[PDB]
Amino acid sequence: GPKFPRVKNWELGSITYDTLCAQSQQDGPCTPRRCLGSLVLPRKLQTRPSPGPPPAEQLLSQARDFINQYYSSIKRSGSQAHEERLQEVEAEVASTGTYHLRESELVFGAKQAWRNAPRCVGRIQWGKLQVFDARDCSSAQEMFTYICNHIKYATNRGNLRSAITVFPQRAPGRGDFRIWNSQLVRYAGYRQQDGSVRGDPANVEITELCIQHGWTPGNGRFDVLPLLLQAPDEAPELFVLPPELVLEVPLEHPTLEWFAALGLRWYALPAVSNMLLEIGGLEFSAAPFSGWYMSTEIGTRNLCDPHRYNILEDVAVCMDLDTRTTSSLWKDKAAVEINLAVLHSFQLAKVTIVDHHAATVSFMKHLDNEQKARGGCPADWAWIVPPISGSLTPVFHQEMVNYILSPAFRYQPDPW
Amino acid sequence: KFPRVKNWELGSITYDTLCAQSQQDGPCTPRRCLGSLVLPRKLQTRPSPGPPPAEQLLSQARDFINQYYSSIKRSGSQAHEERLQEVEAEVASTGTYHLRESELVFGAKQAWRNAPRCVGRIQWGKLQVFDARDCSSAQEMFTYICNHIKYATNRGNLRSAITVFPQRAPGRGDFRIWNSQLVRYAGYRQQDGSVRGDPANVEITELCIQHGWTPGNGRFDVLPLLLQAPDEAPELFVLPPELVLEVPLEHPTLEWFAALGLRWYALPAVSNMLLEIGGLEFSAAPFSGWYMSTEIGTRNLCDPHRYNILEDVAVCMDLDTRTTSSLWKDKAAVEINLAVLHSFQLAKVTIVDHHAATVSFMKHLDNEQKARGGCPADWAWIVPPISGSLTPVFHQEMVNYILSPAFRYQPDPW
Ligand code: HEM
Ligand code: HEM
């Protein structure tokens, strides 16, 4: 058989081979001795900061590779324009120790990075991404304006649109552009006296950083945090998002009338902002991206995780379930109703959202498209399969090959 | 390098130093991870045209013997050195060797302990090992199997057991149980490409008919066994109904559930896996314990390629099957799993729900961290098919590797 990973779909009994993994130039965490596929942050999916510019040879090879990817995408591989661009990059680096991307190249790489994201189940939309070029940005104040513009365009009053805003890349001998917050919109996490946390336990450190930087905290469960934007070599500046910009959805249940009384809510825009966008060896340390939520992210993870809002027991008690015995499946029953409420509340408020069945079904179509288009698709099974009703979705029964392709969205150290 | 492992729910960290003992290779490489693949040729132990070279066999054997004597704390005693000599002498003259009963008992328990995809490993020390190496016919295999079943079932108070048939020998065919489990339901290809019964058993059902089985036509017809002695054609054996404990499915509050006629056997006995101890391979070594509710309620009954009853139940519940957003599938699955737990509980049959099972696995992980410095686990199999994040194991990072003794996959005898 073919000299590549054989992949099977147990529901359909169909087979495919992944030839695309042959293109991977960056090693993952696994070795033939042991699989480290379940680790969230292995030192293999992280790109550490740099106290020195990338060796002109490694950067060049990465640059040449990206340029080849670009021209191939536009079908001019080997052309004069191709050779000229490659020359311009080499010359540029040979003198400055770095280079710059053409506007069309940045748009190509940004879409490719999303396309290459193993942990994203919404990749069927990879072609539809609004790329806001913010490489002219020169201050934290301007970062805020760009971010506000991103939120307005992306939110679009409920009819969400995928977008990313690219701030200036990493320059040797100059500090980075960084958004300290993990997401543009996040709820505060207040550490209480008894030790507990009011709000989102995940955001405890950033909340305390905002306060250390002059933020006057509230004391609610759903307090939107201000941004901590950092321009090169300057301390981070605090900026408050205008409430009218931040669209939220109050959660209610279609039948359980009491669910509304819980006072639960969630913001409409998922905008990751602490990830590094890497293209052709160039590192864009500040490049917030956003799309729309898949219901389980809110109803299951955010609201039900033991280390997050942890409302499973509260909802169970309200449903009058036997919370004293595991075999009553109270957790399962409550989780189902919480997810249903998120779906129902978003549809009612006319805010874009996709449930886990629809999301996975479309990702299967994405896998099929990518099989023909690139001969494979890097996918992290643990992250693609929904946190609830796993085997009830088609992706569970689909084996997957995971590897790193560039351009890519990578994890980076906290600026503090 | 030793992998730093983290529990995202508790913030705790552990370093797996046990993976350093792995000598067998998995499917992953630094270029790409194949951890989600069910059957790589790596975990497989295919047939062979010649004897395992004395060097490799002798090294696996000595390692196992070393593991055994360390277990009884007699590591270094004269019994240890003499057992090592006995093994060397037998391999150098015969190209193979044999195990003592006590070693085979230690081995089988260690095989289970090392099974990455098993969430029931807290019970690893409690295993009844039936030595069936003094078997010379399929007929004998049948008697042994019937006794395993009679013991294991125990009127509903299930007990973990394993029956070990003769090891593979370079000079002949293997002892094999053709069935994937000692107890399974038939799958009859019904004209229009569909299947009556369990679709996962279509092939074996056909084989049984091929060998003279008079088939039935229900959805839950228990299949006869196809047992095979070396270099002989498999023989058909029908299991005595009184030995097959089955549980009729009903729901605690939905009176109409019982009307679905659903039911499932009580004993989960995998019989197609190869057991490897000290380089020796046992091609027929069925093992059983008890079910985890999701195996029946979610996988067996709801998988699209299995009984696929999700929609039927949803219709009975009068759910919105029009669209995915009504979460009709999730609601249906929850009730089915509940009907499974209620039914096994109402009957005399042992069963564990996924919340109880995973909590116990977390305890096992802790025990193993102190005992061996780690524990091979395959995240995709440990995390249940429904309500993944609602369980503690979902938030636990895991390292997956091959330790020996081990249960491995092997080619289908046909
Ligand atoms: C169009 C709607 C989209 C959907 C429904 C979707 C859904 C998801 C989901 C469910 C996850 C896992 C979340 C978690 O477990 O924390 C995820 C991860 C990811 N998505 Fe998407 N995504 C979408 C848009 C985007 C866009 C526009 C980008 C970038 C341009 C993107 C980049 C990624 C990346 C890099 C990750 C990995 C995050 C991490 O490693 O923590 N996604 N997405
Ligand atoms: C005591 C109760 C037990 C429980 C609750 C339990 C549960 C499980 C579960 C849920 C799986 C995954 C099955 C699947 O997804 O198809 C599994 C796999 C497995 N179990 Fe256990 N188990 C138990 C006993 C045993 C015993 C007695 C042995 C062996 C002596 C064992 C060996 C294994 C192995 C090797 C696998 C892999 C199966 C495969 O690859 O298809 N288990 N077990």
Ligand SMILES: NC(=[NH2+])NCCC[C@H](N)C(=O)O
């Ligand atoms: N649909 C997305 N764009 N998701 C990005 C990750 C968001 C993260 N899972 C959250 O719940 O906040």
Ligand SMILES: NC(=[NH2+])NCCC[C@H](N)C(=O)O
């Ligand atoms: N609990 C066990 N030992 N299970 C072994 C595998 C059983 C298999 N998953 C089934 O549904 O029949």
Ligand SMILES: [Zn+2]
């Ligand atoms: Zn792996």
